[PDB]
Design a binder for these strands. Sequence first.
DNA 1: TTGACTCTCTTAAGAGAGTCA
DNA 2: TTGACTCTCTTAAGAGAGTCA
Lengths: 162, 162
Amino acid sequence: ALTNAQILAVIDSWEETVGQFPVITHHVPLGGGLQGTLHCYEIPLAAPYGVGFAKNGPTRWQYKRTINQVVHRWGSHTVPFLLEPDNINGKTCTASHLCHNTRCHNPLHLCWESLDDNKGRNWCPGPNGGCVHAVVCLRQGPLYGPGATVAGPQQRGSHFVV
Amino acid sequence: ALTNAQILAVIDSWEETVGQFPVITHHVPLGGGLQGTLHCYEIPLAAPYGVGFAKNGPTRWQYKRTINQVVHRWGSHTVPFLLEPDNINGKTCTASHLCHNTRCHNPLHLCWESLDDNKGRNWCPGPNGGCVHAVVCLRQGPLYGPGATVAGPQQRGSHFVV
DNA sequence: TTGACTCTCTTAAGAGAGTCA
DNA sequence: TTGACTCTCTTAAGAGAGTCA
Ligand code: NA
Ligand code: NA
Ligand SMILES: [Zn+2]
Ligand SMILES: [Zn+2]
Ligand SMILES: [Zn+2]
Ligand SMILES: [Zn+2]
């Protein structure tokens, strides 16, 4: 809601409900050829999802609570960061999945950062492969790799130089 | 529609016009604390842009040629790759700026790959910092670094485990 | 045949708010 | 009050197509 004590109450009930979502074990690449284990708290695939949760998109959800007879609603993954600044250097803060598992709501698998910082983790080498993120990645990005480039830099004539 | 010889002629006229665009020398990071130099052929900021060129967006342009009475138009950066497959792994190929300078049309600074591969280069450490792209980067991605995370993984109670 | 404009669309990481029961 | 749906928007990497002289 509006008060400091009201926010904390929204965060506590949120944690409480998410703490009951089924816990699924996921083995993941860490970089450097090493492997780790993550434990995600995943929102169900279909209703009911849990007290206060409703699906607004294939993989989008919202959490809502009635405070003083006035209902408040937030993005399902933003609740843990309700007391932090909502922007940085003029950029909007977003909930970033360190586990790269959208259905997961485990706050130990989320961070609060710019959309650019958020996206970038998709290509990070991982905690054991070279990650330089101040708030370290939990795993190697699912998109990290050599890529599959169809054609590289090229010219037919002689008008350009690198 | 167009024959292979006709497409080649289109690539030749594109190179001839782009080659006359102002050439700007840029000093850039290559990773490993090393500094490099890139020479970008930049399309003007306002009309006229050059024979066959027209702006369709703040930072988007198109190239068009009329052959045998029929008008042909392509994205301005896609021309160098008109003789290559247009998709890979069920994904559409896109023009990727190795120099991260949108206005640049230097073909020696572009590659043809999926949008995901394309985006990823924004966070690459660079050719001298550990880049693993099969078609190597020309410089360090502008977004590579520790980031500016506002809040990290946290919980108030004890319902969660990593 | 050309130049200088106009418009909306794609992706995959993310969001906001309204309609019913 | 709480649940289950519906709709469109944001961003920064990229696109196709129309009008008019
Ligand atoms: Na993310
Ligand atoms: Na790019
Ligand atoms: Zn998770
Ligand atoms: Zn990282
Ligand atoms: Zn360039
Ligand atoms: Zn690279």
